[PDB]
């Protein structure tokens, strides 16, 4: 099975899929080719939980239900510099406006 | 031009509606004009006695949005064989992205407050455009 | 290969280049691996993002297709984007 992701970090998300049965560390391989930063600087997250290079994204959470195409699921991502990684850090999207009292 | 054929060739089938809007069928009588029929739910399924060569169309029974059966816009029965009836898989197209949010938006506003929104007057025209049975028919034809 | 679409409040979506060239009009802009949208802000293009998904994985499909959803306090700035786009 393909799982839909969105990889977030500050105010970058990259959209990729993934198989269920691709690993935590795969995927920060996927993460090295777009964003040129190797996986023993990364760290990735399920909300605020930290996930284990060996564990395949289904035992983390990601699944056909959770992460679909029209939905996917989020993966944190932080950043190591100078031996010590940064806290995990998603910048929200913009606010709609109110809705338009004609809606 | 676009109509039933008057085979009186009986052909069972089955509507299978896999799609999350009511689905209204439509049939093109033998003169072409579009004939209504009971209002399919989501989900459910119906058996329904038709005939070779006759023409089948499927909506959305509130917004007319067009709906794909079997991966296409016409439902031909044809030759019961076997026995087992025919099956009209009734599904969702992929929408344009546009198309969507003029669905999205009109189910919200009433269309004389289509221009009480602000956007470009080009799309109160498309929002007013509303999908319609007839309209489709010419394009086909 | 992946571009990277930037929304008017500086936010980086990065989607593949294969997903981005469904829009005729992201085509023409690319045509060079970035694309500035000064009047998109990211709640809209997130939502785009996410249909380039939609669209490629349910077309052509004989399975059930679901629902592309949308909230309606994104409908208006949903539809701007997608007539500007042609999507």
């Not at chain 2, 439902?75 to 026995?83: A, E, I, K, R």
């Not at chain 3, 085509?27 to 949208?37: P, R």
């Not at chain 3, 297709?65 to 994104?74: G, N, S, T």
Request: glycine share 4%; proline share 8%.
């Amino acid at each position: 099975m393909d799982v839909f992701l969105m990889i977030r970090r500050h105010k970058t998300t990259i959209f990729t899929d993934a198989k269920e049965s691709s690993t935590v560390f795969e995927l920060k391989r996927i993460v090295e080719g777009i964003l040129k930063r190797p996986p023993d600087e990364q760290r990735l997250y399920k909300d605020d939980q930290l996930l284990d290079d060996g564990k395949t994204l289904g035992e983390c959470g990601f699944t056909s239900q959770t992460a679909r195409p029209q939905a996917p699921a989020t993966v944190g991502l932080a950043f190591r510099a100078d031996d010590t990684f940064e806290a995990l850090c998603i910048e929200p999207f913009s606010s709609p406006p109110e809705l338009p009292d004609v809606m | 031009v676009l109509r039933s054929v008057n085979s009186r060739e009986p052909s069972q089938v089955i509507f299978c509606n896999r799609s999350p809007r009511v689905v209204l069928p439509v049939w093109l009588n033998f003169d072409g004009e579009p004939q209504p029929y009971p209002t399919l739910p989501p989900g459910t399924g119906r058996r329904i006695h038709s005939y070779r060569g006759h023409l089948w169309l499927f909506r959305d029974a509130g917004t007319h949005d067009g709906l794909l059966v079997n991966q296409t816009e016409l439902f031909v029965p044809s030759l019961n064989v076997d026995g087992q009836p025919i099956f009209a898989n009734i599904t969702l197209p992929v929408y344009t992205l546009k198309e969507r949010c003029l669905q999205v938006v009109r189910s919200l506003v009433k269309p004389e407050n289509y221009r009480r929104l602000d956007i470009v007057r080009s799309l109160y025209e498309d929002l007013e455009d509303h999908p319609n049975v007839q309209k489709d028919l010419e394009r086909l034809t | 290969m992946y571009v990277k679409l930037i929304s008017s409040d500086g936010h980086e979506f990065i989607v593949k280049r294969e997903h981005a060239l469904t829009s005729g009009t992201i085509k023409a802009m690319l045509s060079t691996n970035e694309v500035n949208f000064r009047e998109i802000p990211s709640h809209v293009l997130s939502k785009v993002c996410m249909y380039f998904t939609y669209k490629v994985r349910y077309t052509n499909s004989s399975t059930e297709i679901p629902e592309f959803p949308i909230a309606p306090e994104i409908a208006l700035e949903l539809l701007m984007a997608a007539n500007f786009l042609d999507c």
